[PDB]
Amino acid sequence: HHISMINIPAYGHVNPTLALVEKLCEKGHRVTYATTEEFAPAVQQAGGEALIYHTSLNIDPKQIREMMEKNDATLSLLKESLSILPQLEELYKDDQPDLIIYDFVALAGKLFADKLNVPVIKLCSSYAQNESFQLGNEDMLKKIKEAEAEFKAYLEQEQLPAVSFEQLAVPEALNIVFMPKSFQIQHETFDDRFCFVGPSLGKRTEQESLLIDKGDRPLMLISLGTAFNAWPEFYKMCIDAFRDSSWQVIMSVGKSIDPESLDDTPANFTIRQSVPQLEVLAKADLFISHGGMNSTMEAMNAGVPLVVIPQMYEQELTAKRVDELGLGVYLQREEVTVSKLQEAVQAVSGDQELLSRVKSMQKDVKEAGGAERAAAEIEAFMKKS
Ligand SMILES: O=c1ccn([C@@H]2O[C@H](COP(=O)(O)OP(=O)(O)O)[C@@H](O)[C@H]2O)c(=O)[nH]1
């Protein structure tokens, strides 16, 4: 059976799938992955055949911080669906797939699946959505009124057979979500076509030899993820906040920034562009994180409290949520100072009550499926559909 995974080129939107791809293959299913070259090694390691599309999205964190002019930045994902559909058509012309699985922003995978009337499962790598819970601000539901400005540029080259924008908000037969249903916002509103398996961890690209036995001293991880990590000011404040302190600190600065471009690295710090986050959290006593869903779930999967410094709306939702569920503290940026970094690491470390809350989220996130349940919910959907 040929399963075709369609996704954007983004670590946070593609890493959960890797563990999934490893399982489907272990079940004797050919899995093809429509990605760029940046991800073909990760996809190839899981067992997928990478099939490449030349892409229109930004990958380098520098390019994501600039092109923050916000001229309908949401449209990017639409235009990208319209660049990617033609190339998916060609990639699979004589390799039609039995099952298309597409990430919630890879609309190209929806259109492509419609156009071939092939079964389609939707992976939600962030919060899922439905008729009740539409995620987004006042200003981000009033931006899908400028999504319609481009939707009247849909009749400038081709046409829609009828209404086709209420069919991108609408969920599919099976919608796998990579958090536990408790952590989903408006959980109760989500019916049985949503399947909340929590974090989908497995093997990752071999990162550098970062052995870190630490000692009888506590270990803190610092990372703003893989896209909104282009903030030199923050990485200096962390060095100022925790140099030569109780804490052993491992800080990922992303690909936007030189570990030599900073102040000289304290004896207690390790500083890299990239760390093996799953390995570090196996030893971390605290994680200063940006509230990426992968990071938030990888933390809870390791029993690791959270200081959440969100960069984007999606991330502020996850940041409020972590506070509301008392799984750590919400520290806003443009409120982030060296004193405030210290106050929060203080307030979260040695709150035994808070630590017990994430120790039970550790259970609650593993009690959900994982990649195994998702691969079961997938194959079962294959037999049925
Ligand atoms: O130094 C790093 C930084 C990030 N990641 C991985 O990148 C993903 C980040 O996804 P998330 O949704 O947290 O944030 P995003 O990167 O999408 O902004 C997670 O799976 C991390 O395990 C990693 O492995 N090492």
Domain that includes residue 151, residue range? 1-204+368-385
Minimum-distance ligand 1 atom for the alpha carbon of 226: 16
Contact call for residues 289 and 311 (beta carbons, < 8 A): no
- Long-range Cβ contact pairs of 216-219 (< 8 A, separation 24 or more): 217/246, 217/247, 217/248, 218/246, 218/247, 218/248, 218/285, 218/286, 218/349, 219/247, 219/248, 219/249, 219/250, 219/280, 219/283, 219/284, 219/285, 219/286
Do the strands 120-124 and 219-223 form a parallel or antiparallel pair, or are they unpaired?
unpaired
Number of domains in the chain: 2
CA dist 25 and 41 (Å) reads: 16
CA atoms of 269 and 222, how far apart (whole Å): 10
Give the torsion sign (CA, 115, 106, 175, 159).
negative
Length of the chain: 385
**217 in a labelled binding site:** no
**Residue 149, token pair as written in the block:** 């400005």
Same domain as 213, residue 116: no
The tokens describing 294, both together, are 């992968």
Q: Are residues 16 and 157 in the same domain?
A: yes
- Are 183 and 35 within one domain? yes
DSSP for residue 11: H
269 bridge partner residues: 249
| 180 & 226 share domain | no
Do residue 88 and residue 116 come from a single domain? yes
> Would you say 17 is a known binding-site residue?
no
CA of 274 to the centre of ligand 1 (A): 9
- The H or E element spanning position 35 is strand 30-35
- Select from 95, 136, 138, 99 the least CA-distant residue to 117: 99
146 and 244 part of one domain: no
- Structural method: X-ray
Strand order in the sheet with 30-35: 49-52, 30-35, 2-6, 99-103, 120-124, 175-177, 194-196
User: What's the reported resolution, in angstroms, to a tenth?
Assistant: 3.0
First to last CA, the chain: 13
Work out which ligand 1 atom sits closest to the CA atom of 293: 12
